[PDB]
Design a protein around this ligand. Structure first.
Ligand SMILES: [Mg+2]
Length: 277
């Protein structure tokens, strides 16, 4: 794998910045990486590389997947999509450059979660999903996709999402997350295990904990197995706002205990997903 897993950054109420782990990979003390954010070079900030390609911010030394507020403020990020590039510099190999996405959310931002395998793809796309997510994002929510696929296919799944077209409605753009069992290096290897096998929940509670706990960021989730429902309950999502789709393609509104469909849900869009202030 050679790329960036999408980076999410949240501005806290006191205008500080907190972030999820950075997952940068190239595929060794000589090499030092530099960062370009929105075509601007970020001064005085660099990352280092471990033997297995895992990259980190060396912080005085602790090797950190999550940079501090001071590092992230230098990024000069803007709300929404931001383009960030990582340039591997070495005497032996010159410049090797990779590109990725970094997202800046406000602390009062509300997120909606989607699984891809079985939820966006038939157990091959479900027929009304793009209109549903477009209408959800239009009301002021943010779509956040979630994947448990191997790291090798990370760029394919994200590219697959953009090419999806359904009656002129395209999926709204948002970061794609990975269960930590897919992202394993010696830096994060020991923590991924205190998290047992509940990887999907651990990632969502981790994403929830990037926000202040005086607020509930994760509004609702979309899934296709019991694990998707379990994860959203654990992450601060009510059973009312949890929808799992079966192989026969019926969206089960879990809290209301009725079967529905993406087109039906889209019909009652405002009552299920109210327009935010
Ligand atoms: Mg699934």
């Amino acid at each position: 794998f050679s790329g960036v897993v999408d980076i999410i950054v949240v501005r806290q109420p006191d205008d500080s910045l907190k972030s999820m782990p950075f997952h940068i990979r190239f595929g060794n003390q000589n090499i030092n990486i530099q960062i370009t954010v929105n075509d601007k070079k970020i001064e005085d900030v660099f990352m280092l590389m471990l033997p297995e390609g895992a990259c980190y911010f060396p912080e005085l030394i602790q090797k950190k997947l999550r940079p501090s507020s001071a590092i992230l403020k230098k990024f000069n990020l803007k709300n929404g999509y931001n383009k960030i590039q990582f340039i591997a510099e070495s005497d032996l190999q010159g410049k090797q450059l990779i590109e990725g996405k970094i997202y800046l959310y406000n602390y009062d931002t509300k997120l909606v979660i989607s699984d891809v395998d079985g939820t966006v793809t038939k157990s091959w796309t479900h027929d009304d999903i793009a209109e549903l997510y477009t209408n959800i994002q239009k009301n002021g929510y943010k779509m956040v996709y979630l994947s448990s696929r191997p790291l090798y296919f990370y760029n394919y799944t994200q590219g697959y999402l953009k090419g999806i077209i359904q009656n002129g409605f395209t999926m709204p753009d948002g970061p794609i997350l990975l269960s930590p069992d897919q992202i394993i290096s010696s830096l994060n290897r020991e923590v991924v295990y205190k998290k047992a096998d509940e990887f999907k929940g651990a990632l969502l509670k981790d994403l929830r904990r990037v926000f202040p706990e005086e607020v509930n960021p994760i509004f609702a989730g979309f899934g296709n197995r019991d694990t998707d429902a379990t994860a959203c309950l654990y992450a601060g999502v009510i059973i009312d706002n949890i929808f799992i789709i079966n192989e026969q393609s019926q969206v089960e509104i879990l809290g209301k205990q009725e079967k529905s469909s993406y087109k039906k849900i889209n019909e009652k869009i405002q009552e299920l997903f109210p327009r935010l202030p």
